[PDB]
Amino acid sequence: ADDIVLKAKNGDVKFPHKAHQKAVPDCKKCHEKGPGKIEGFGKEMAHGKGCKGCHEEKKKGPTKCGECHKK
């Protein structure tokens, strides 16, 4: 499958799966979550444990606006 881009108005956000599979070998961090996770994702989650928050806890991955958002 292909990577996806989240169409944030302030700038596209790329989600590179290969890097995540490698850096987060514990797949259950994202997969086999209960229902609601597709509907649930948004800016709140992204800026929280959905994206940025994991980067902060693991001490790797983009945490600055322009590192995720790019026109």
Ligand X SMILES: C[C@H](CCC(=O)O)[C@H]1CC[C@H]2[C@@H]3CC[C@@H]4C[C@H](O)CC[C@]4(C)[C@H]3C[C@H](O)[C@]12C
Residue 14 C-beta: closest distance to ligand HEC, Å = 5
CA 47-48-50 angle, to 5 degrees, is: 95
| CB contact set of 4 (below 8 Å; sequence gap of 6+) | 15
30 known ligand binder: yes
Contact map string, positions 8 to 37, toward ligand HEC, x by CB under 6 A: xxx--xxxxx-xxx-xxx-x-xxx------
20 known ligand binder: yes
Nearer to ligand HEC, 51 or 71 (CB): 51
Strand locations in 1-71 (E): 4-6, 13-15
Annotated binding site for deoxycholate: 37, 49
